[PDB]
C-alpha cells in the first residue's frame, strides 16, 4: 500500500493534536496535551485508492524541537493550522510556509491551509475570506475551516492533503 508522510504544523494551541487525534482515533482530546511529537497511523481510502497515512503532530512553532528542518524536508504534505479565534496564529503561518519552501527549495509543495475551531464562530477574529485570500497568495488550491471538537472537516483535511500529494 502507498504510504503518505503528513506533517501537521502551526502555533501552539490551535488544535494540531486535537485534529490529529480526532482523525486517527475518533476522539476529542479535551485538555490532553501530548507535547511528545508523535506520529499517528491510519489507513483510509481516498478517491478509490488505498492510502496508509502517517501523521506527525508537531509541537507549536514557538517551542523547541531539534527536528524541524528534518520534518520539513521529509514531509510529503503539510497541514498548516491556525485558529479562527487568534489572528497571531494565522499570521504565524506565513513564516512557517516560507521555512518549508526554503527547505524544499521549491514552491510546489503539497499543503492545506486549515482554520480550526469553527465551533467558536462567536469568538472569530480571522475572516474566512482572509483564509481564502492567504491560500490564494500561496497559489494553493486547498483551504478548509474545521472543528476538532464538532468533527467538522476533520477527515477532509487529511483526504484533501492526500489529494494535493497525489494530484
Ligand atoms: N472549541 C474547540 N476547542 C479546540 C478545538 N481544537 C482544539 N481545541 C482545544 O484547544 C486547546 C489546544 O488544543 P491542542 O490540540 O492541544 O493544540 P496544539 O497545541 O495545536 O496541539 C485544547 O484545550 C483543545 O481542547 C476545536 O476545534 N474547537
Ligand atoms: Mg499539540
Curated annotation (Swiss-Prot):
**EC number(s) recorded for this UniProt protein:** 3.6.5.2
Name the major location: membrane
Its recorded reaction(s) are: GTP + H2O = GDP + phosphate + H(+)
Name listed for the protein in its UniProt record: Ras-related protein Rap-1b
Q: Which InterPro entries does the UniProt record give?
A: P-loop_NTPase (IPR027417), Rap1 (IPR038851), Small_GTP-bd (IPR005225), Small_GTPase (IPR001806), Small_GTPase_Ras-type (IPR020849)
Source organism: Rattus norvegicus
GO terms under biological process: calcium-ion regulated exocytosis; cell population proliferation; cellular response to cAMP; cellular response to forskolin; cellular response to gonadotropin-releasing hormone; establishment of endothelial barrier; establishment of localization in cell; modification of postsynaptic structure
Q: Where is this motif: Effector region?
A: 32-40
Its activity is regulated as follows: Activated by guanine nucleotide-exchange factor (GEF) EPAC2 in a cAMP-dependent manner.
Residue numbers of ADP-ribosylserine PTMs: 39
Query: Does the keyword GTP-binding feature in the UniProt annotation?
Result: yes
Family designation = Belongs to the small GTPase superfamily. Ras family.
Question: SMART domains, from UniProt?
Answer: RAB, RAN, RAS, RHO
User: Which keywords accompany this UniProt record?
Assistant: ADP-ribosylation, Cell junction, Cell membrane, Cytoplasm, GTP-binding, Hydrolase, Lipoprotein, Membrane, Methylation, Nucleotide-binding, Phosphoprotein, Prenylation
Binding positions for GTP per the UniProt entry = 10-18, 57-61, 116-119, 147-149
